[PDB]
Amino acid sequence: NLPARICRDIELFHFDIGPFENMWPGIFVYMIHRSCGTSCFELEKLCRFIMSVKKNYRRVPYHNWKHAVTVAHCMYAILQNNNGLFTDLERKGLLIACLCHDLDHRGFSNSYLQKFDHPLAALYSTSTMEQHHFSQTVSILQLEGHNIFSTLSSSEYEQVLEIIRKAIIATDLALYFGNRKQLEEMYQTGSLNLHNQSHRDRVIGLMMTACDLCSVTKLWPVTKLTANDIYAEFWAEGDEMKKLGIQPIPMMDRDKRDEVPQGQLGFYNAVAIPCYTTLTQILPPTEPLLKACRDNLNQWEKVIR
Numbered sequence: 001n002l003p004a005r006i007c008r009d010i011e012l013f014h015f016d017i018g019p020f021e022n023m024w025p026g027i028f029v030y031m032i033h034r035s036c037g038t039s040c041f042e043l044e045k046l047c048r049f050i051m052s053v054k055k056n057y058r059r060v061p062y063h064n065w066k067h068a069v070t071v072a073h074c075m076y077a078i079l080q081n082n083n084g085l086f087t088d089l090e091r092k093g094l095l096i097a098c099l100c101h102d103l104d105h106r107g108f109s110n111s112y113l114q115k116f117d118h119p120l121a122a123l124y125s126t127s128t129m130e131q132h133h134f135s136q137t138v139s140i141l142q143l144e145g146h147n148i149f150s151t152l153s154s155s156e157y158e159q160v161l162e163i164i165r166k167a168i169i170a171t172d173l174a175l176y177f178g179n180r181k182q183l184e185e186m187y188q189t190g191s192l193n194l195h196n197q198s199h200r201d202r203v204i205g206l207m208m209t210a211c212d213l214c215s216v217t218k219l220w221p222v223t224k225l226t227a228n229d230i231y232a233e234f235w236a237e238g239d240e241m242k243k244l245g246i247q248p249i250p251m252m253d254r255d256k257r258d259e260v261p262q263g264q265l266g267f268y269n270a271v272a273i274p275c276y277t278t279l280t281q282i283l284p285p286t287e288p289l290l291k292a293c294r295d296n297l298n299q300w301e302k303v304i305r
């Protein structure tokens with residue numbers, strides 16, 4: 001059963017899930033139980049599912065099991081602070097989606113798989129890894145005793161899988177820019193309609209980006225350390241680009257590592273700050289994410305000075 005410190009601090013947007021891997025499954029179950037009720041899933045089926053998901057994450061520096069649970073936690077914090085906005089089915093689906101959203105990640109970008117001519121890039125031409133992550137989710141669900149959605153009607157099953165598919169695909173950052181642009185226009189013109197399924201899908205998309213990027217919304221020591229893990233992957237990809245005979249972009253080129261603070265400044269300006277700004281506009285209770293993001297921006301600026 002969850003430690004008292006975790007019971008309290010799990011409610012903070014900037015909660016960090018700690019270094020004890022065996023505690024993460026219980027942390028996830030607790031979040032499921034709190035958002036979705038204890039009768040939502042059969043406990044034994046749920047536990048079996050969680051452990052098979054864990055098993056199909058790889059031991060890569062960043063896109064790993066810890067990332068999955070962290071992203072799920074941010075979604076939990078959003079849902080908890082926006083009571084009554086999201087349906088029972090959306091809440092179950094999104095938390096499951098977050099847990100599954102990087103399944104079987106290799107630590108390489110879609111761009112790298114394309115340049116490598118990987119079989120997955122022939123199968124899934126766009127949002128390559130994200131299509132795979134969804135494929136893996138379904139495969140796990142179809143294992144004997146793993147169908148946590150077995151108590152839903154066929155219709156609700158199809159519905160929640162579609163919620164999950166859309167949510168997982170939305171974590172393709174390439175899609176974020178267009179999505180956020182549309183949402184910002186809808187907000188400014190007062191045309192955003194949460195009762196409109198297409199608009200709803202966009203908001204959920206933005207939520208997924210916000211959760212996926214949430215390492216930039218932690219307190220500075222956490223954010224600073226996490227940056228090590230993301231660059232470990234990017235620089236390895238850069239190495240691999242060089243081995244293909246292709247000059248990587250500076251972000252992936254370990255030779256350009258001294259420019260990390262400037263690169264971070266660019267990312268916060270172009271992606272992170274706009275993302276959380278738009279999210280807070282639509283869901284005011286998410287403001288702590290934006291505050292924490294601005295704080296980290298300031299820290300990077302301080303590094304530069």
Ligand SMILES: Cn1cc(-c2ccncc2)c(-c2ccc(OCc3ccc4ccccc4n3)cc2)n1
Binds near residue numbers: 227250262267
């Ligand atoms: C999907 N996603 C999550 C993250 C993230 C970010 C921070 N903490 C955890 C996760 C990122 C991400 C985006 C940009 C980035 O660097 C931008 C950049 C650009 C030019 C550069 C030139 C030289 C050196 C470095 C340079 N970095 C690093 C990570 N993408």
Ligand SMILES: [Mg+2]
Binds near residue numbers: 101102171172
């Ligand atoms: Mg991903």
Ligand SMILES: [Zn+2]
Binds near residue numbers: 067102171
């Ligand atoms: Zn992710």
